[PDB]
Design a protein around this ligand. Structure first.
Ligand SMILES: CCCCCCCCCCCCCCCCCC(=O)OC[C@H](COP(=O)([O-])OCC(O)COP(=O)([O-])OC[C@@H](COC(=O)CCCCCCCCCCCCCCCCC)OC(=O)CCCCCCCCCCCCCCCCC)OC(=O)CCCCCCCCCCCCCCCCC
Ligand SMILES: CCCCCCCC/C=C\CCCCCCCC(=O)O[C@H](COC(=O)CCCCCCC/C=C/CCCCCCCC)COP(=O)(O)OCCN
Ligand code: SF4
Ligand code: SF4
Ligand code: SF4
Ligand code: SF4
Ligand code: FES
Ligand SMILES: [Mg+2]
Ligand SMILES: [Zn+2]
Lengths: 97, 112, 114, 208, 230, 124, 176, 96
């Protein structure tokens, strides 16, 4: 930025940091507004052979839901919807603020 | 022994083992009033005996929390209380009876 | 058949609830005219209450009558708490709608409506 | 590999099926059906008066700690005798799972309020009442939540027109906003989009 | 007596002479088709209705193959799906890129059956065929680059309308549908070739460019120009 | 449980205006197949729709105006009985059209080459 | 993993107690906040000098609509109504008929700019790049009726903005 | 190519012009009528006819992916030019 050396020093002292390192106004460090043309990739289904839609058809593999039990239609162990969630580990990066 | 449970409104219990034993015994006593063939009775009796056996075999609180996998011992006590209340209500509701009524002919048919 | 009763097991209990709601609405018209600073009379308000009660006089189902008194109680509590504005209270009167013709010849002159 | 097809999780499918059988055995009086959709979602269809028992069980049971009510809504299907379908979405934080409970009702049949089980049911059931006309029996405060004061009709029913029946404007003669019958400068243009050819054979219904 | 056949393993009791397409229709399955119309004769030339039988190594034309006793018709098998994809690939290989300027628009069987039974990508890296447009009067507009040579108009003209003025001239990829001469196809039943033509090759000239099928609302009334009451 | 023997009537609860309850005749029908296509998938369910009302031209922009709330309202039913019950409980008048299904037809490819019958085709 | 945002306890040594007592009696953190605000005072403002300076924009920006032409001057729109079909807000009204030379061309093309949600679906769905959402965004009017554009207005917009529209489409057509 | 109606009102490229007795002309009083001066029909008629020595030509409108969908036009009828119907461009075979 454009600032006098006195003003920069006063700003640094008042805020207790080096503001010139982290500036909130953008000075020529950003990308140019004109860029070279791109050339994007195609994808996995852009082959000329071995590419039949019936083998890569997601929607047609959807099924009606499976009827586990219907009213119309040994000692079993009690079950749970899923295994119990594991206890979280305290962060190694910074456990406390 | 610990200062906080980390959860607002959940206080540390000084005597977790005694409270858990009391609660599990009370739960088992309530389950005795349910018909023997009820599926509810067998399952919750099984899991209560499973949990009650651990509280009588592990005197260390951290090891007991590890074995129960219920979070913290205060959470375990709260869940035992919830289970006891549910057992009383189920004794009142009696859900082991056959189905109340079947739905109409096409009540769950989809798409429609 | 054996349908679940919402509030009333018979039409007489439903009539009782209707009468209670009518008393409540009747006794609140002076307060509503005063609080909302309406330009209508208390007699006009009571006549509107009677008219709104009387357009459901053909109902013979206790469950429909229970639902009607439930909705009437809700819209009575909207008036008492001044949740409604003067706008809604006067929406009960249709003071801005033109008089719709009701005879065949007038409807024929006006347009295509049956 | 199949880059464009969503992978499946048979382990979670098995776990959900096992828990559905578990619940159906524990509560024979009310559970009418149990399904597991192939993207691993468990769904329990119950008789409408088992709402409080089934929800309290799913909340308080040790092997089903569904302490959180994610949502509560209804679906309107006019072709059914019980057109309205009440849907409860529960979340279990202890077992990191989610469940769905489905109930049916019509216009004149109340459903017991579940505010004694979940506190979010209060506003959820107020919205269901406001938008569909379903009455909840023992509700602390059942009134309109989203519609205008004095609004007549329940807009989310399938037989309710999209633009409704009345519209508002300010009238200078009476110096207030007025409600007048709806009248559109350009009428909503209804498009017929459905293709006359069947898309998914797996859902084909019997000719009957 | 009725014989028993199977569609995807489900038993159907069908009269002898019933075709595979009609048996699948009986169980509720509509086999894709371009050249087949139930009011016209059977051509079997578009090859879009090919299905697999349980033990047959070869696909059969569902529209022209009578069912035999104890046949299992695999309507959603790999062989049937690949056959449909190949046929649709050939059709769209020579078709022109005219959908936005085509009155058939959102009511085209080539489009709908390409979205339902065909592949979503094109392998055709050559030039397309362009066909001269014929003129058959003021009612029917012909843009014959969109013709798929299903010969419905020929069969309809001949059998239904008793007019034998339509046919196929030439052979091979350069086979064309028309009159071969500047003759107008004027008949009291001429718009039905507009209806039965699956593609935009035959379109209504009065209706040209005015609307799109999704916009329109449909009112079911009767006809008052004569006493048939159509 | 209580026993009441009445025809279901919910007009007082639906909030529809009286004119749109009493002057409306709906049409219960199965849609006719679009003759421009050979698919038959849109002829499976019953439809309920209202009678057409007036549409005029906007003085500004010339758009199409309407004053009929039920102009775009179309309901889908799986059965004629369901559609009729819905119309009856909502109090509308209704006209029911019986479903039209194509009759079975005898198709024979070999008929194109008859020795003595007129079914012999002059071209393929 | 997780972390605690507020779980630390202060040190109870006499030095720390005196430091906290000084912070209480002498408003140290309050003066620190004052210093931060003063630092911002001596920084440079971020305000641009509108209307003489404009904020950055991109070729993808969706502003006012326009109907384009081929280099010959012929309209690109062929009245295919794909934009009308895809429009979320039902803001496009189209009516077409054969032209005097038999072309498939529109007779009515309206866009209600008070109904439009400026989503850009119409220019995605256009197969001929006829309807575009140009770079203009300063077109506020004084009456509601002036915001109901028709074919003449949209063609005028295309003719006025064609250079910039062409440049933006050239810049961004390889990402499409 | 704009044209003026007998009432003084400009005629648009669709032929629109309010009648003499139409009240709706009041909206233009103390204001103007929005009419685009360039007529696409006139400009495309001003375009010349290209001659190519092949039975079938292809037009994509110019620019490739910045034009219209590529179509093929059959130049066999010697009594008329083949018109690309996306862009209205005429093509012909060299005669004589
Ligand atoms: C009046 C004395 C003469 C002043 C100079 C002559 C100017 C013309 C006359 C004044 C007219 C107003 C001028 C306003 C701006 C002019 C246009 C402009 O922006 O030019 C660009 C140019 C800035 O260049 P730049 O390239 O943009 O700056 C580089 C960066 O962008 C930014 O880099 P930065 O962030 O590092 O900032 C650079 C900074 C770096 O400066 C320093 O480091 C020097 C120390 C800090 C500044 C000290 C300011 C004064 C003391 C503190 C007061 C609180 O420099 C300044 O801030 C310049 C300060 C000059 C002060 C001169 C003495 C003025 C005393 C006013 C006292 C008012 C209150 C007391 C009561 C008065 C009663 C009459 O302007 C100047 O350099 C001129 C100074 C601007 C402010 C002058 C204000 C004077 C008071 C106004 C009224 C005077 C008449 C009496 C009125 C009596 C009552 C009716
Ligand atoms: C030789 C013997 C001499 C004997 C004299 C010894 C005295 C010297 C040492 C004691 C001096 C103490 C200073 C007196 C002022 C203290 C005020 C105070 O009570 O401090 C704060 C209260 O003060 C505030 O909180 C200030 C709030 C408002 C601040 C907003 C503006 C302040 C920022 C501007 C700085 C002001 C600069 C003053 C300049 C004056 C110029 C004339 C404590 O309150 P709490 O933290 O909330 O806790 C108390 C209960 N637990
Ligand atoms: S006939 Fe069908 S696929 Fe061919 S251009 Fe027309 S709409 Fe497109
Ligand atoms: S013009 Fe139409 S009906 Fe005739 S053969 Fe071609 S695609 Fe079939
Ligand atoms: S930007 Fe979106 S809302 Fe606006 S006209 Fe285009 S499609 Fe419609
Ligand atoms: S999508 Fe493009 S070519 Fe089609 S009608 Fe709209 S503006 Fe015209
Ligand atoms: S429909 Fe059978 S081959 Fe054409
Ligand atoms: Mg056609
Ligand atoms: Zn071109």
């Amino acid at each position: 930025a454009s600032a006098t050396r006195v003003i920069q020093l006063l700003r640094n002292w008042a805020s207790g940091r080096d503001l010139q390192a982290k500036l909130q106004l953008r000075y020529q460090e950003i990308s140019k507004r004109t860029q070279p043309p791109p050339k994007l990739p195609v994808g996995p289904s852009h082959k000329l052979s071995n590419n039949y839609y019936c083998t890569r058809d997601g929607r047609r593999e959807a099924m009606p839901p499976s009827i586990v039990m219907s009213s119309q239609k040994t000692e079993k162990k009690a079950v749970t919807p899923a295994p119990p969630i594991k206890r979280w580990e305290l962060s190694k990066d910074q456990p406390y603020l | 022994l610990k200062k906080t449970t980390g959860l607002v409104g959940l206080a540390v219990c000084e005597t977790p083992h005694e409270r858990l034993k009391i609660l599990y015994t009370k739960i088992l006593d309530v389950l005795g009033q349910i018909p023997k063939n009820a599926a509810y009775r067998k399952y919750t009796e099984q899991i209560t005996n499973e949990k009650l056996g651990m509280v009588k075999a592990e005197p260390d609180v951290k090891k007991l929390e590890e074995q129960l996998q219920g979070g913290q011992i205060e959470e375990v006590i709260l869940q035992a209380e919830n289970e006891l209340s549910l057992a009383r209500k189920m004794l009142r509701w009696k859900p082991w009876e056959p189905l109340v009524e079947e739905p109409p002919a096409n009540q769950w048919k989809w798409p429609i | 058949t054996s349908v679940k009763p919402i509030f009333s097991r018979d039409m007489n209990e439903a009539k009782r609830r209707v009468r209670e709601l009518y008393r409540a609405w009747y006794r609140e018209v002076p307060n509503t005219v005063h609080l909302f600073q309406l330009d209508i009379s208390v007699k006009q308000g009571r006549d509107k209450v009677r008219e709104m009660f009387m357009k459901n006089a053909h109902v013979t189902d206790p469950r429909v009558v229970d639902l009607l008194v439930i909705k009437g109680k809700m819209e009575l509590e909207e008036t008492i708490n001044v949740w409604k504005q003067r706008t809604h209270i006067m929406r009960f009167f249709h003071e801005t709608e033109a008089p719709r013709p009701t005879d065949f010849l007038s409807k024929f002159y006006v347009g295509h409506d049956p | 590999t199949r880059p464009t097809i969503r992978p499946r999780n048979d382990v979670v499918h098995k776990q959900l099926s096992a828990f559905g059988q578990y619940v159906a055995e524990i509560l024979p009086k009310y559970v009418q059906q149990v399904q597991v959709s192939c993207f691993n979602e468990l769904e329990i269809f119950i008789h409408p008066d088992g709402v409080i028992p089934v929800l309290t069980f799913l909340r308080d049971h040790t092997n089903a700690q569904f302490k959180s009510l994610a949502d509560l809504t209804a679906v309107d299907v006019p072709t059914r005798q019980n057109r309205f379908e009440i849907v409860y979405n529960l979340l279990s934080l202890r077992f990191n799972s989610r469940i769905r409970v489905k109930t049916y009702t019509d216009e004149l049949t109340p459903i017991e309020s579940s505010v004694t089980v979940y506190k979010a049911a209060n506003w959820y059931e107020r919205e269901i009442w406001d938008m569909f006309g379903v009455f909840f029996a023992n509700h602390p405060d059942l009134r309109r939540i989203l519609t205008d004061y004095g609004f007549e009709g329940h807009p989310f029913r399938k037989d309710f027109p999209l633009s409704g029946y009345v519209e508002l404007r300010y009238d200078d003669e009476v110096k207030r906003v007025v409600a007048e019958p709806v009248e559109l400068a350009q009428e909503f243009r209804k498009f017929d989009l459905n293709s006359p050819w069947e898309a998914f054979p797996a859902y084909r219904q019997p000719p009957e | 007596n009725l014989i028993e056949v199977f569609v995807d393993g489900q038993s159907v009791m069908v009269e002898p002479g019933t075709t595979v397409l009609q048996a699948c229709e009986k169980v509720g399955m509509q086999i894709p088709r371009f050249c087949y119309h139930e009011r016209l004769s059977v051509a079997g030339n578009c090859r879009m209705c090919l299905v697999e039988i349980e033990k047959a190594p070869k696909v059969v034309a569902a529209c022209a193959m009578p069912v035999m006793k104890g046949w299992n018709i695999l309507t959603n098998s790999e062989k049937s799906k690949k056959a449909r994809e190949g046929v649709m690939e050939f059709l769209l290989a020579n078709h022109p890129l005219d959908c936005p300027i085509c009155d058939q628009g959102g009511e085209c069987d080539l489009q709908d059956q390409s979205m339902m039974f065909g592949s979503d990508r094109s392998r055709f890296l050559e030039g397309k065929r362009a066909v001269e447009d014929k003129n058959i009067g003021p009612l029917v507009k012909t843009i014959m680059t969109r013709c798929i040579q299903c010969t419905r108009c020929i069969r309809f003209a001949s059998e239904i309308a008793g007019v034998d003025d339509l046919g196929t001239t030439g052979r091979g990829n350069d086979m064309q549908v028309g009159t071969y001469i500047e003759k107008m196809f004027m008949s009291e039943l001429s718009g039905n070739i507009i209806d039965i033509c699956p593609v935009g090759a035959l379109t209504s000239k009065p209706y040209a460019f005015t609307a799109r099928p999704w916009e329109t609302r449909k009112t079911e009334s009767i006809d008052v120009m004569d006493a048939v009451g159509s | 449980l209580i026993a009441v023997d009445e025809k279901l009537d919910i007009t007082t609860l639906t909030g529809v205006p009286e004119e749109h309850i009493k002057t409306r005749k709906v049409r219960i029908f199965v849609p006719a197949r679009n003759n421009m296509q050979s698919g038959v998938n849109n002829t499976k369910k019953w439809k309920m729709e209202f009678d057409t009302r007036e549409r005029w031209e906007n003085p500004l922009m010339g758009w199409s105006s309407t004053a009929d709330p039920l102009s775009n309202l179309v309901l889908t039913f799986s059965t004629k009985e369901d559609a009729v019950a819905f119309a009856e409980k909502n109090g509308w008048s209704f006209d029911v059209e019986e479903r039209k299904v194509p009759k079975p037809k005898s198709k024979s490819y070999g008929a194109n080459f008859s020795w003595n019958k007129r079914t012999r085709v002059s071209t393929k | 993993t997780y972390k605690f945002v507020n779980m630390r306890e202060p040190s109870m040594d006499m030095k720390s107690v005196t430091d906290r007592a000084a912070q209480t009696l002498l408003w140290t953190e309050l003066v620190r906040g004052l210093g931060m605000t003063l630092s911002y005072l001596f920084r440079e403002p971020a305000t641009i000098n509108y209307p003489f300076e404009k904020g950055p924009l991109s070729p993808r920006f969706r502003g006012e609509h326009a109907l384009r032409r081929y280099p010959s001057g012929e309209e690109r729109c062929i009245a295919c109504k794909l934009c009308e079909a895809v429009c979320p807000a039902q803001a496009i009204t189209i009516e077409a008929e054969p032209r005097a030379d038999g072309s498939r061309r529109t007779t009515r093309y309206d866009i209600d700019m008070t109904k439009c949600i400026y989503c850009g679906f119409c220019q995605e769905a256009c197969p001929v790049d006829a309807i575009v959402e140009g770079p203009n965004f300063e077109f506020s009017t004084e009456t509601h009726e002036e915001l109901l554009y028709n074919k003449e207005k949209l063609l005028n917009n295309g003719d006025k903005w064609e250079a910039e529209i062409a440049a933006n489409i050239q810049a961004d057509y390889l990402y499409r | 190519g704009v044209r003026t109606s007998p009432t003084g009102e400009k005629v648009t490229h669709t032929g629109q012009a309010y009648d003499d007795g139409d009240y709706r002309r009041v909206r233009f009083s103390d204001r103007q009528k929005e009419v685009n001066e360039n007529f696409a029909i006139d400009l495309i008629a001003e375009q010349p006819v290209s001659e190519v020595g092949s039975r079938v030509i292809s037009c994509d409108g110019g620019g490739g992916a910045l034009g219209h969908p590529r179509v093929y036009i059959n130049l066999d009828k010697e009594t008329k030019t083949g018109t690309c119907g996306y862009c209205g461009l005429q093509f012909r075979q060299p005669h004589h």
